[PDB]
Amino acid sequence: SSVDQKAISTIRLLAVDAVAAANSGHPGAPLGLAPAAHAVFKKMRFNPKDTKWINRDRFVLSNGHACALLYSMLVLYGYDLTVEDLKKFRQLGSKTPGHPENTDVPGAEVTTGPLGQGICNGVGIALAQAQFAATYNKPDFPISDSYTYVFLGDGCLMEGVSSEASSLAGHLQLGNLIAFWDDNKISIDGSTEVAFTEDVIARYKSYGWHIVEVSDADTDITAIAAAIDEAKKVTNKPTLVRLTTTIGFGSLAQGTHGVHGAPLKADDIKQLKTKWGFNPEESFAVPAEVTASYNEHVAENQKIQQQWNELFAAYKQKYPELGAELQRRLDGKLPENWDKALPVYTPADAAVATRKLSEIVLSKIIPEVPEIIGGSADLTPSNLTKAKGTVDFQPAATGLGDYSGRYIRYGVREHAMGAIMNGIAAFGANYKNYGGTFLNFVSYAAGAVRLSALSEFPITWVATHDSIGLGEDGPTHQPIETLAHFRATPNISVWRPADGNETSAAYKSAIESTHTPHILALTRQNLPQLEGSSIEKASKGGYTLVQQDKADIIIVATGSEVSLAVDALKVLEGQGIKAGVVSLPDQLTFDKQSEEYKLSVLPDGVPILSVEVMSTFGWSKYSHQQFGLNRFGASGKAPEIFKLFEFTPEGVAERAAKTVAFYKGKDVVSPLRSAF
Amino acid sequence: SSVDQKAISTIRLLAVDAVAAANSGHPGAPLGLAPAAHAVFKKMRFNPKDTKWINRDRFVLSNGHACALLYSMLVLYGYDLTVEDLKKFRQLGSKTPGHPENTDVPGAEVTTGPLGQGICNGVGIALAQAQFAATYNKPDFPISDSYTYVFLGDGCLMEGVSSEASSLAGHLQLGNLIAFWDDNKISIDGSTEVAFTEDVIARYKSYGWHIVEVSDADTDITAIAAAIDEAKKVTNKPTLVRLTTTIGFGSLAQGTHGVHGAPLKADDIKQLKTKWGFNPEESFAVPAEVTASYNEHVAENQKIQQQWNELFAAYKQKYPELGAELQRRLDGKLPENWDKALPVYTPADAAVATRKLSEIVLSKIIPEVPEIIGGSADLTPSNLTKAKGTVDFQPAATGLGDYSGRYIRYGVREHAMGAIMNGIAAFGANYKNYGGTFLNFVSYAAGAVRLSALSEFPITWVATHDSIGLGEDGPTHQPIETLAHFRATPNISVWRPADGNETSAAYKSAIESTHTPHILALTRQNLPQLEGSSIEKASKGGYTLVQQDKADIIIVATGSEVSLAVDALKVLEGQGIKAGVVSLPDQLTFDKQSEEYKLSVLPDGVPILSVEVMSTFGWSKYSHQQFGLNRFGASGKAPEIFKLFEFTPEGVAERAAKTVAFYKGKDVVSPLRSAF
């Protein structure tokens, strides 16, 4: 009460002092949201000493620039983050980076800062919670009953990705999602009147959300707590709580854009402290009564988790099969020998498009690995991402699925699908989740994909129609730059399998992943089964498909161009040129192999030509010369497009012959060599 | 009447026959939207023989997969597109590609197919029209009074980019925008009930749009025409017309997802023809009464344009200064010697961040070039994109600006900003428009940026905070992959100027552009004025900044790393190594120079090391070894991040020395050489 007010002041002043010490960062939203943070964390169930308790409530700061607020809460509650870490806010190597990162910050569920992402991550956490609860809960066994609390600002509400995810969350009736809009009428460019005058509340009602409005969120923590209680009674709608706040509340500069994103003036900090009963000569004060009050809540939460552990033990007795499955998932382990379900092919099998091979893999592994769920952005019958016989993830009230379903209809929402996948991964419980679209439209989701990599989440894009091989839809659909973009992003495995065995290797990697997102670039068109491919060899990312001791040239290729390279080898033989072929289904996986393995694939002393029907960027890592497509495509029958751009056996052979000639009398060393 | 019905049938059957001949494409939405297309084009003012008449109404097919409908309208109205072109729908090299492309299709204002883009392009066309009208119209001189008509589907309404643009368009009170939702309750994955159950109409009202609902848009062309008349009376709101249609109307498979995206069965086409009075044995029928009726409307429109030409002549008499400016703009010519306003610097001038240099350029050229308008995605005081003293583009009713304003508050809406910029460029009248955000968040707009390149639109991104040099905001804000992504996209000039003179060259290129979008990657941090830079040399895209005959190594760098390379040259001199320095402010501009010019910059016989604090992808085009940053960044003071990653004079010198050693006794040829 008095202690509640002191806690709020403590939070506010820790945040302002952290910004002040860094002389960098964002004091405004922390000042405005400290009452709400105090109220929400008092309602949340969490263990600072076990950040991975699966039935914890989750908190996401979607307005991630406000992270001094989050860090202050985590410090006050005794997470593995201290006042000394706050004093190192925004400093190189600290645990308090300028935007929250789940890899570095204990209690940061996701990485935010790029606006709009966190609320979508919250949708995914809530989606996973609903699916998890439907899969495991039993009468008298509420294994999963947690909530997902999200703070977001005007910036997040302006980013289209949040509209996508909010439309979908309302459709999915996600009643355990409770989001709070920091309604402070200020963004970087000033008043929201200059660019953001829509009726946000009316829009959220149009999505099927419940609304609670708190008119004085600067002080009315009673109403904020009551809004949470109200939201919990509305079990079939996500709730948006409108928190009408003053940005920078208490500052001389409150209610202005100047308090958004720069440190307060020293005299402003002094009057903040004196107004709230603190010592203006002191920084980073933590009144012991605040610590005590917060510790009481932690102790209660720890007793809740202790009881949850006993509930889980009793669950394993009453439901031994589900209990063992749940234990395995919480231990982060896939089913024993699950990969024996992966399809295997021989060169005698028929040609198949890698999108169809992907369908077949999914159909075999989904029944074996319950923690696989996924969907498509309105391309299910084109991406081939649904296993026959599975049920869609939908609220049962719709009649269209159930929360125990495993297939998500994302609609035409690639960016939100990407960020929702990140939230599903962030939920934990070993979820291995995927999302289908055309490769060219993965680009719509770049904001989220990049965060999958930075956050180290094992999400998977099923990215079909990978090239000019899709044909008639034409250049607005045909990737050119796309693989280069994602390969140039740290920590993305970009698999472009050539055939059945390679597609199984790509899935083995994607599903086994624990820290690396995957993009599977798959074909519309049929490709032959290759002589020399296997799951084992393709699992190395790059391998020698056709070994030619005494090669005059090695052709390195991916996907649809491996078969082309093999056909070019035969043309070259007729010209008296001996070629080897390397298949490079994943450059990242290949890069992580030993130097000796990599040199066995790309040796010294032989010219290497790359062939891939998109950008040549990156390919000089593996080749001396590069045959690619650095112009936009065309609308026509796919074989005619390939002929137009000379991606034919003869066109490849011609460039291979020119490569052999270009290096005659030169000393050639592997592209893997470098000066540093 | 009877002729109206025959026209609608003609449109429907041309579209279905085009799909049938290609055995590829999308018959459903063309069948459903033919009544609306017929009605809208009858209300539109356009000249098939002058696609660039500046006061034409514009039409945008945002659901671009429905382009057989658009092509049928263009053929029937006598644009430079014939039945023979329709017979070549989706065929290599035809003028009827599988999605409309403004470069290839007469009467296609923009390139659509990637969902959500076209409606945003329409917002930009309407924005430009409003700004253009406010700038030039005078009493009795309605130089510009045209409308922007957009067709869009459920897919476009699900893509977040359309929410961004619709929020902004409602805020901007764009009363000459009239959009039509194809409300057919079907997408690729089936019924919209599976993923898209929001109250679209309520959402559009929340943005401040006017609504008209047409309950039977399969037949009620009277109500569609009346909806247009109603929309035109609402001058301070964009209008959404809900067209309740049956996808594939008339087909045996109408009302199903199967009619969305594959050819109809032959017997289905036969019964379509017989039901509508056509010969089932005939394809591509064009009844002469339809041609006649459409020609009447063209003739009336041509008389309207003829009168507009006389109005323009009278305008030039009454308002000679504005008239000459308008003529110049319609001739596609910038003001004579406008570039004399570009700022010029010497090495004696102070260090300045290239974001601040950009502000100064804009402040000098905006007063000289009226066709420059632009804005920022809620980063105006950080991107520095507004010239002091200019007025924002806002409806005057808000009191916050005027439609004659030149500065757009886009809000936190990068993707819509990108697509709106494309629409402003598509309007014509020599508009040279720009949009500011942080470089890392240009990625949120990749869907639109790619279309800027494919559409050949001279738009400009003012992309500040380009690297780890931004410091404390950390890795969620620091570009790594971003330049590689856009450089790998065909037809994007990616300028990364090092200093004042280079920044002026970058703007000279961006503003003179007529077919190439520009991204200007600009710094937060200060950089020195370079000895050896000039507008003239930087205008070549790459140039020798420090010439060293007898160089042991050449260091090629961009942006902030050019000064670093110059400092490394001094360290190397102390180690007995002579270096030259190349500055490469735009790789695309450089690539377009003559081979002899390029070789004068990157000669044979000398190792070349690239230095740029982001991905090394692409750099092997210009260098033998590459020093870059292929991992994510860090949150800290920027100079400490540079030190951590060894982007220091000593760290560059060390790698340069290792490069010299690596090539000792090797024959080195320019990276510009290739085997083919």
Ligand SMILES: Cc1ncc(C[n+]2csc(CCOP(=O)(O)OP(=O)(O)O)c2C)c(N)n1
């Ligand atoms: C995708 C993206 N675009 C731009 C930014 C730059 N940026 C950070 S905060 C911010 C404005 C935030 O306004 P709001 O969310 O209302 O925060 P508040 O001012 O209330 O603290 C912007 C534009 C960003 N972080 N992410």
Ligand SMILES: Cc1ncc(C[n+]2csc(CCOP(=O)(O)OP(=O)(O)O)c2C)c(N)n1
């Ligand atoms: C950004 C983007 N994502 C995905 C696609 C793939 N695609 C084309 S049409 C379409 C569905 C369109 O549904 P709707 O707009 O309702 O069209 P209709 O079925 O009514 O013809 C999809 C998902 C695309 N063209 N663009």
Ligand SMILES: O=C(CO)[C@@H](O)[C@H](O)[C@H](O)[C@H](O)COP(=O)(O)O
């Ligand atoms: O327009 C689009 C996607 O941009 C879709 O309809 C796309 O054209 C699909 O290829 C068609 O629906 C046909 O699908 P598929 O034969 O490629 O599986």
Ligand SMILES: O=C(CO)[C@@H](O)[C@H](O)[C@H](O)[C@H](O)COP(=O)(O)O
């Ligand atoms: O959080 C964000 C952007 O992601 C913004 O507030 C960003 O941090 C800006 O850098 C701050 O507002 C400070 O701006 P500036 O000093 O870099 O111009």
Ligand SMILES: [Ca+2]
């Ligand atoms: Ca705000």
Ligand SMILES: [Ca+2]
């Ligand atoms: Ca539809």
